[PDB]
Design a protein around this ligand. Structure first.
Ligand SMILES: NC(=O)C1=CN([C@@H]2O[C@H](COP(=O)(O)OP(=O)(O)OC[C@H]3O[C@@H](n4cnc5c(N)ncnc54)[C@H](OP(=O)(O)O)[C@@H]3O)[C@@H](O)[C@H]2O)C=CC1
Ligand code: SF4
Ligand code: SF4
Ligand SMILES: [Zn+2]
Lengths: 136, 117, 239, 181, 114, 61, 387, 123, 331
């Protein structure tokens, strides 16, 4: 629910410094258990507590003040929108897609000068002719 | 690095971005259009913009060349590329490869080269 | 006795058959007894009004009637007024062109006998020049429908108040559902800055439109197909 | 009455506690009302990305369809067995009148029966001429019914109507809508 | 939501230009040119989605035999220019690099029901 | 064949509630009227006696 | 000489629609009206002649964008009647109960949006919430939300998840409370009953002459419904009462919509108990795709998988008019097959088209706030009417 | 929808060329009478006799059609455009379709000879 | 949709770059000219790059503020208009903004001093700073604009510095093409009609008799674009004057006869006039300038040795023909 008792007891469980951060971050008091963190660095949680509405269970605590969505890792981003039971820290490595190259994680850079730019991948259709004269 | 911007003026990007790939500098298609052509085409909408946060998507021709060439006991090989963990139908469809000629033979979907031995 | 003690459904025995035995059937048999019924009605209609019916046809219990252009109103009265034949209700009308033939457009009507739970379809024909009359004298909602298929084709409805275009640009010229008329049309829209208004400039695309019906087999790969004609109403052989 | 009010412990809803439940039973319009929240460890668990039922799932199929040995395709074909669009001229109905029917033909002399066919197939007679030519039994057999009645506009499956009225109705009286079925 | 091109294990582009994705994108958002590369196998030269008109039919996913383009369930990619919205091959391979985890997770629940 | 797809329970589900769940709550309307007149008349008994009290206070001033 | 005639809405008069609508007011009384529709008119019919039936299917969930699934259904029905194929049993029930949860969605949007247009704010949120619960149920079956790439002209796109058929029952038990709850402040409701008691009377024979259908024609008193008159999709095999109104008012047209929730929930009760097993698509691989399990294994499945996605499936020539009972009304479709794989022509009969066409026969004499209660119970979503 | 709008007429097909001519003459009088209303309503930049010299030359475009019934469809289209302009139904953006040539003098190098066509390969 | 922009199709530019205008000239087409317009958010610049992007020349737009830059996107297709930020101060941004520009113009002129820019800053110094890089990059068809009455002489520090900027443009990259337009009038002009549309005071000196011939702004923009592309414009001073010389009393009476209102008149002399305009500089929204005082005693000094509209086959319109349109919504 949203009663005074619940917000009071969860604030008393978490701790007032993290509470004072969280109230400036979200409007709610939420007490999870650190299921896992991000390669970008984003602490996630999951709520046991019985007085929760549907799909209020799992949530992010970000890192940056200038947060948004799509700053999360994909294999987490599934679980944040509740795709899986098993968060990727607890999945077997058989379900890990094996890759032959390192990973970089560009989140999004819209408006930032790191924005994506487009171009046609291929050259022009018809190549010209280079001028090669012939002294007769 | 410094390439002519159709006027004698040179544009100067670092050698980390005169690249087809982080894995390969050279082109691999007849109409590949190397980046030296591309910045030569439209640097107009590339100024005041970052050079780092574009894709550079780790091109495949280097990654396929260092996979071990497998061996087949009999004559006709089979390729799927399918995992044995994933509960479904993935990979490329079940085509077969004759390996008789001297040299390996890439499965024309997955690019894995097989050899008769 | 409380919501903590409610059972789940996700663990239980469910029904589990090894292999369902679904019989095969052509989905036309269920029509057939009615379809052979319907013909007896349809022939009756031609015997009823032989001045105005060029023909009837039916294909999988959709009864289709064949009316000359100057012939619409005397049929539609009879389709409305008879106790045995009361359709009472326009459903949709539109046109279909066939520019291969001389009379270009053909105008199709749909009705719905809500008493007797039946449908009927009425086809006439009209060249773009010549009209078809309006059934807005009887059917009241049809004046809206006739307002529609005017603009899409140019096919008229003589005897009709409020005949004017609808569901297109007001200053539009031509007709959209016409096989000579191109897909993107002629004029596109952009906001000119200097006139402080939008202007209608002729068409320029970024990407040219690409149909893919150029890859097409000439003969329609569907076969001839059997009939469902009633044994009463096909021609008896001699001897 | 088979779908009437059921009490709220079979409704799959977040419910209440137990002194507040004892409160809200005294304070509600009906006690058997769900607050709308589904139960969290029941509704949408396990997530559809991780379903153990989804691990083994080959194909749904039926026995005359998946039978490899017995059927060919052309027996179970359906696209090339469509009915033909039966078209009827004005003229072929005159053929149906005088030449007769495959049920009851009116034509002997199969050589000259073609000649009697063909002028009508070329337009020797007219339809109203055939109507005057058609006998009373002809008209009452193959145009009208056997009582000489016009055929009712025929329907696919006629659905007779009940009117449910009493306590099984979805509204009692006073409310204007009835619930026929 | 938005698109990506998968890759093989040991990293190969997985898209052949069967052009089915060009053939049945009912808004014609797909545009492909493709050439035989150095080794002789077919690969795509330019693969391009017009994401102005990607209508989220998802038919383009169901049209790949080799399962190269998929539907990444990201929706949070809102751009500020139309120029940013023309996904060429490089952006889609970058998305296939990025979302590779979740696309494995999704096909581990959908590849039966495909 | 058919395996792994979802099916109903072999026992089936419970029957749901689809009727008008409308209890005619409260009291008889005459009880509301009689309680109204009771609350009124008790208020008038408190009012007019206090008014006459105030009038005697006015005399005293 | 004429009234000081107004433009009703450029942008946001009636929610979910661009209702440009000429009114001639003489006492705040409409002597005549003239709605100009065309503001959404994308010209979709000119497009659908250039695409294959395979591709032509998500034109139609764009049409009537509050009840996508009946449009999907009616085009699949027109093509299955045209192709002479038969969807299997499992397919019939799954299409049936999706076409009824879409009915629940449609009336849940329409009644609450009409209550907001009148001014009742609370169902306008209490209903859209349960609509979000149903967005979830579109989401597990098919693609994203609000535009389902679903029922194919061969039948069904694909099977359910492993547990939707369970989960929807957990929803269906509590929809009854959440429906009677919004019923409790609009049905008796002397404000609503005042505003809607005889407003816009629609007599019987004039309802037929205006070509109207669905809840409006059934509100006028005529017992007509395609689910029971000309049945299909095991609506025969599922017991289902139908409500029929008494007056020609908007109040019957309200009360019938309230009733159809109670009816379409009983649909789900008789569907989730008796969902059979069997093939969810059509049996053959010649009008829809083979499953992706065996096309990587069989040579025959590839060529079907390729031709259905380059050419598509070939249709016998002919023409059909299949009309079914959308929750707006009788929605029809008239397709004319070339015999090619593009439809040579395809008209829609959007249901609200004649509803808009029958406006100023009903709206004469009434008031201008009374000219709003008439709007959203003939349900002009305007995705339908022009196209 | 028993009743029409203000100026809309039941469409009816004149049997003679003269009756068509009578209707067209009355129609041009209707345009010419309503022309000062248009410059007020559509708020146009320019003057009323420019409207009038367009309305004249548009009928000059179709003075030389032989057929009765092709002039009949032509008259019906003209009456509908009258019906649009007499109300607010067209807007001034759509109203200014009829003057492309007036609002902007064309621009430099309007191609006239073969050469100006050729140097931009006929535009 | 035709190229009424160009003379031809194929154009090599002066610097030797090949430009082929493919397609048929509309919005979707491409012409090939990479253009750069400094200060394009200004009132001349919007009408300028509107016609410049109407035929699909790629317009590089340097901006200063992020809000006013937005309403110039609509006149270009994808890749046609582009944006990049810069200050007049930072030379690297000037250097960057003109790297691939075929052609380039600078309508930078500010009628008042800020607390960070004077006339000597933004007319003679910054123009030097930018056309230096133009000389560094061999950019073809450089166009500079100065105002009318652009002298070397004192009495308007604005006009004192405009001719200084002219001499600097003649000095470095010396073939630069200089244009001096007349006073300008358009829909919401800067200080010439909208100031005359509404005014609680309407006070200025001279007893309203300074003389000029104002030009409609779209005629200036069409004139500029017809300059932009041909030959026979290089290193030539351009007087661009309207068809007939006016006086301020004539102008204001022509305004007020269509307004049918009493436009106020105060016309007080210079002494009390100056000190009121002195105090307006501390206010962030722009007010009438204390150096706009001086130009009221000045008039249109036309150079006879320049090239008119009729050089490039154009006839601009007359202000009496336009007076009903432009101050119509104040009726
Ligand atoms: N009738 C007239 O007004 C006359 C004017 N001219 C000249 O024509 C040109 C354009 O005319 P007009 O539209 O009226 O004037 P503008 O409004 O265009 O003048 C300001 C423009 O130049 C920019 N500008 C000024 N200073 C700077 C600076 N330090 N940094 C960046 N940008 C600056 C402005 O930037 P921002 O967009 O951020 O505001 C704005 O774009 C001007 O140069 C003017 O001097 C010549 C003859 C007649
Ligand atoms: S989902 Fe996207 S890629 Fe697929 S057909 Fe639609 S627009 Fe094309
Ligand atoms: S993603 Fe699939 S449809 Fe698209 S080009 Fe690759 S194989 Fe073809
Ligand atoms: Zn392979």
């Amino acid at each position: 629910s949203s009663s005074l008792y619940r917000v009071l007891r969860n604030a008393w469980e978490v701790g007032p410094r993290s509470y004072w951060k969280q109230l400036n971050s979200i409007g709610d008091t939420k007490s999870g258990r650190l299921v896992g963190t991000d390669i970008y660095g984003n602490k996630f949680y999951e709520t046991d507590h019985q007085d929760e509405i549907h799909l209020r269970t799992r949530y992010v605590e970000y890192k940056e003040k200038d947060y948004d969505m799509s700053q999360v890792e994909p294999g987490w981003h599934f679980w944040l929108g509740y795709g899986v039971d098993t968060a990727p820290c607890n999945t077997p490595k058989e379900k890990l897609p094996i890759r032959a190259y390192p990973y970089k994680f560009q989140p999004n850079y819209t408006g930032t000068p790191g924005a994506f730019v487009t171009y046609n991948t291929l050259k022009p259709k018809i190549s010209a002719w280079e001028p090669v004269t012939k002294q007769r | 690095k410094s390439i002519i911007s159709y006027n004698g003026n040179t544009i100067e990007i670092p050698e980390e971005y005169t690249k087809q790939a982080p894995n390969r500098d050279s082109t691999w298609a007849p109409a590949q259009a190397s980046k030296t052509e591309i910045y030569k085409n439209n640097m107009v909408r590339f100024e005041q913009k970052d050079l780092s946060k574009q894709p550079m998507p780790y091109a495949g021709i280097e990654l396929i060349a260092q996979q071990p060439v497998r061996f087949v006991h009999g004559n006709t090989a089979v390729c799927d590329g399918a995992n044995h963990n994933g509960p479904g139908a993935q990979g490329h469809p079940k085509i077969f490869i004759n390996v008789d000629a001297p040299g390996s033979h890439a499965c024309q979907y997955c690019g894995t080269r097989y050899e008769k031995e | 006795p409380s919501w903590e003690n409610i059972k789940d459904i996700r663990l239980d025995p469910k029904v589990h058959v090894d292999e369902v035995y679904e019989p095969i059937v052509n989905p036309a048999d269920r029509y057939l007894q009615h379809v052979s019924d319907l013909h007896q009605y349809a022939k009756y209609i031609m015997a009823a009004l032989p001045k105005y019916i060029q023909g009837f046809s039916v294909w999988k219990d959709e009864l289709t009637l064949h009316v000359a252009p100057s012939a619409v109103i005397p049929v539609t009265t009879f389709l409305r007024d008879n106790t045995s034949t009361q359709y009472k209700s326009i459903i949709d009308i539109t046109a279909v062109d066939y520019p291969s033939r001389e009379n270009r457009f053909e105008v199709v009507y749909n009705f719905l006998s809500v008493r007797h739970n039946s449908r009927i379809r009425l086809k006439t024909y009209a060249t773009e020049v010549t009209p078809v009359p309006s059934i807005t004298c009887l059917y009241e909602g049809a004046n809206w429908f006739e307002r529609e298929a005017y603009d899409m084709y140019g096919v008229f409805f003589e005897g009709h108040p409020d005949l004017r275009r609808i569901m297109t640009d007001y200053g539009f010229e031509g007709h959209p559902l016409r096989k000579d008329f191109p897909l993107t049309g002629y004029t596109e829209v952009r906001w000119d800055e200097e006139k402080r208004r939008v202007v209608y400039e002729p068409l320029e695309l970024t990407q040219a439109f690409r149909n893919f019906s150029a890859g097409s087999t000439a003969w329609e790969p569907v076969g001839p197909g059997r009939d469902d004609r009633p044994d009463s109403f096909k021609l008896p052989t001699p001897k | 009455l088979p779908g009437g009010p059921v009490p709220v412990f079979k409704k799959y809803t977040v419910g209440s506690k137990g002194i507040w439940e004892k409160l809200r039973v005294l304070l509600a319009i009906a006690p058997n009302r769900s607050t709308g929240n589904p139960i969290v460890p029941l509704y949408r668990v396990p997530t559809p990305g991780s379903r153990p039922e989804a691990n083994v799932y080959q194909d749904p199929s039926s026995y005359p369809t998946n039978d490899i040995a017995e059927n060919p395709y052309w027996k179970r074909d359906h696209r090339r067995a469509y009915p033909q669009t039966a078209f009827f001229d004005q003229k072929t109905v005159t053929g149906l009148l005088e030449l007769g029917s495959e049920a009851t033909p009116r034509i002997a002399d199969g050589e000259a029966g073609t000649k009697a066919l063909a002028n009508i197939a070329n337009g020797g007679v007219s339809f109203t001429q055939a109507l005057g030519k058609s006998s009373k039994d002809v008209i009452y057999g193959e145009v009208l019914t056997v009582n000489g009645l016009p055929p009712v506009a025929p329907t696919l499956a006629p659905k007779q109507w009940k009117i449910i009225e009493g306590e099984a109705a979805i509204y009692p009286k006073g409310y204007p809508c009835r619930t026929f079925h | 939501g938005e698109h990506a091109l998968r890759r093989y294990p040991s990293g190969e582009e997985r898209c052949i230009a069967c052009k089915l994705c060009e053939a049945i994108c009912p808004a014609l958002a797909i545009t492909i040119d493709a050439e035989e590369r150095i080794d002789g196998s077919r690969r795509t030269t330019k693969y391009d989605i017009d994401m102005t008109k990607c209508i989220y039919c998802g038919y383009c996913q169901e049209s790949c035999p080799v399962d190269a383009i998929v539907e990444t369930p990201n929706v949070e990619y809102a751009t500020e220019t139309r120029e940013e919205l023309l996904y060429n091959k490089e952006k889609l391979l970058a998305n296939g690099d990025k979302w590779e985890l979740e696309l494995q997770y999704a096909l581990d629940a959908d590849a039966p029901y495909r | 064949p058919s395996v792994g797809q979802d099916l109903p329970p072999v026992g089936g589900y419970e029957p749901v509630q689809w009727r008008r769940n409308l209890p005619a709550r409260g009291f008889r309307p005459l009880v509301y009227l009689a309680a109204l007149c009771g609350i009124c008349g008790y208020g008038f008994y408190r009012a007019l006696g206090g008014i006459q009290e105030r009038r005697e206070l006015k005399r005293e001033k | 000489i004429r009234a000081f005639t107004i433009n009703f809405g450029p942008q946001h008069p009636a929610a979910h629609g661009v209702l440009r609508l000429i009114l001639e007011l003489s006492g705040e009384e409409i002597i005549r009206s003239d709605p100009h529709v065309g503001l959404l008119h994308r010209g979709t019919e000119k497009l659908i002649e250039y695409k294959t039936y395979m591709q032509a299917l998500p034109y139609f969930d764009r049409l009537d964008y509050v009840s996508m699934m009946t449009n999907e259904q009616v085009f699949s029905l027109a093509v299955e009647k045209l192709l002479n194929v038969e969807v299997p049993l499992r397919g019939k029930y799954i299409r049936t109960m999706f076409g009824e949860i879409t009915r629940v969605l449609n009336h849940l949007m329409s009644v609450c949006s009409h209550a907001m247009d009148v001014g009742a704010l609370t169902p306008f949120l209490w209903g859209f919430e349960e609509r979000e619960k149903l967005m979830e149920f579109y989401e597990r079956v098919s693609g994203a939300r609000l535009h389902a790439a679903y029922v194919r002209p061969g039948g069904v796109s694909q099977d359910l998840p492993a547990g939707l058929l369970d989960d929807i029952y957990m929803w269906a038990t509590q929809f009854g409370d959440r429906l009677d709850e919004i019923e409790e402040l609009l049905t008796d409701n002397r404000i609503w009953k005042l505003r809607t008691v005889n407003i816009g009377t629609v007599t019987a024979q004039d309802a037929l002459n205006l070509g109207l259908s669905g809840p409006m024609l059934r509100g006028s008193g005529i017992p007509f419904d395609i689910r029971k008159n000309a049945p299909y999709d095991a609506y025969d095999k599922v017991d289902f009462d139908v409500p029929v109104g008494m007056n020609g008012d908007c109040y019957d047209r309200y009360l019938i919509r309230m009733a159809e929730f109670r009816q379409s929930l009983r649909i789900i009760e008789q569907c989730c108990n008796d969902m059979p097993a069997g093939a969810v698509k059509v049996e053959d691989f010649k009008i829809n795709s083979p499953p992706r399990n065996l096309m990587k294994e069989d040579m025959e499945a590839l060529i079907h998988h390729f031709l259905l996605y380059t050419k598509g499936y070939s249709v016998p020539p002919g023409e059909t008019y299949t009309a079914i009972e959308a929750p707006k009304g009788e929605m029809g479709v008239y397709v004319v097959s070339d015999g090619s794989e593009r439809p040579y022509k395809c008209k829609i009969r959007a249901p609200g088209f004649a509803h808009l066409g029958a406006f100023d026969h009903i709206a004469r004499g009434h008031f201008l706030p009374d000219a709003v209660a008439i709007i959203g119970t003939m349900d002009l979503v305007f995705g339908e009417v022009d196209r | 929808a028993i009743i029409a709008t203000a100026f809309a007429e039941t469409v009816k097909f004149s049997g003679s060329k003269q009756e068509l001519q009578k209707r067209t003459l009355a129609l041009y009088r209707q345009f010419l009478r309503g022309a000062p209303t248009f410059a007020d309503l559509y708020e146009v930049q320019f003057s009323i006799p420019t409207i009038r010299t367009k309305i004249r030359q548009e009928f000059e475009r179709h003075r030389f059609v032989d057929d009765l019934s092709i002039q009949n469809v032509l008259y019906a289209k003209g009456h509908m455009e009258y019906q649009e302009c007499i109300n607010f139904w067209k807007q001034q953006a759509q109203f200014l379709k009829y003057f492309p040539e007036e609002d902007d003098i064309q621009g430099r190098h309007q191609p006239s000879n073969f050469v100006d066509k050729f140097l931009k390969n006929r535009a | 949709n035709s190229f009424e922009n160009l003379a031809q199709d194929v154009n090599i530019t002066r610097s030797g770059k090949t430009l082929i205008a493919k397609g048929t000239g509309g919005r979707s087409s491409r012409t090939g000219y990479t253009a750069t317009v400094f200060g394009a958010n200004g009132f001349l610049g919007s009408y300028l790059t509107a016609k410049l992007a109407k035929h699909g020349t790629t317009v590089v737009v340097p901006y200063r503020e992020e809000m006013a830059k937005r309403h110039l996107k609509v006149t270009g297709d994808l890749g046609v208009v582009n944006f990049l930020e810069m200050d007049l101060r930072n030379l690297e941004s000037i250097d960057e903004a003109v790297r691939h520009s075929d052609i380039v113009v600078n309508l930078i002129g500010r009628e008042y001093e800020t607390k960070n820019f004077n006339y000597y800053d933004v007319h003679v110094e910054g123009a030097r700073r930018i056309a230096e890089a133009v000389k560094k990059h061999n950019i073809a068809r450089y166009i500079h604009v100065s105002a009318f009455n652009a002298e070397i002489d004192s009495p308007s520090e604005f006009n004192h510095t405009k001719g200084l900027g002219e001499q600097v443009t003649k000095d470095i990259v010396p073939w630069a093409t200089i244009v001096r337009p007349a006073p300008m009038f358009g829909r919401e002009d800067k200080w010439f009609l909208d100031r005359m549309a509404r005014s609680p005071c309407l006070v200025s000196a001279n007893k309203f008799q300074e003389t000029s011939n104002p030009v409609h702004v779209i005629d200036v923009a069409a004139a500029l674009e017809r300059i932009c592309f041909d030959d026979s414009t290089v290193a030539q001073t351009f007087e661009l004057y309207g068809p007939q010389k006016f006086t301020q009393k004539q102008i204001i009476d022509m305004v007020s006869e269509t307004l049918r209102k009493e436009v106020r008149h105060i016309e007080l002399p210079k002494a009390l006039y100056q000190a009121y305009t002195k105090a307006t500089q501390a206010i962030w929204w722009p007010t009438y300038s204390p150096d706009q005082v001086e130009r009221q005693f000045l008039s249109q000094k036309i150079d006879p040795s320049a090239k008119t509209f009729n050089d490039l086959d154009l006839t601009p319109m007359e202000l009496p023909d336009l007076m009903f349109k432009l101050i119509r919504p104040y009726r």
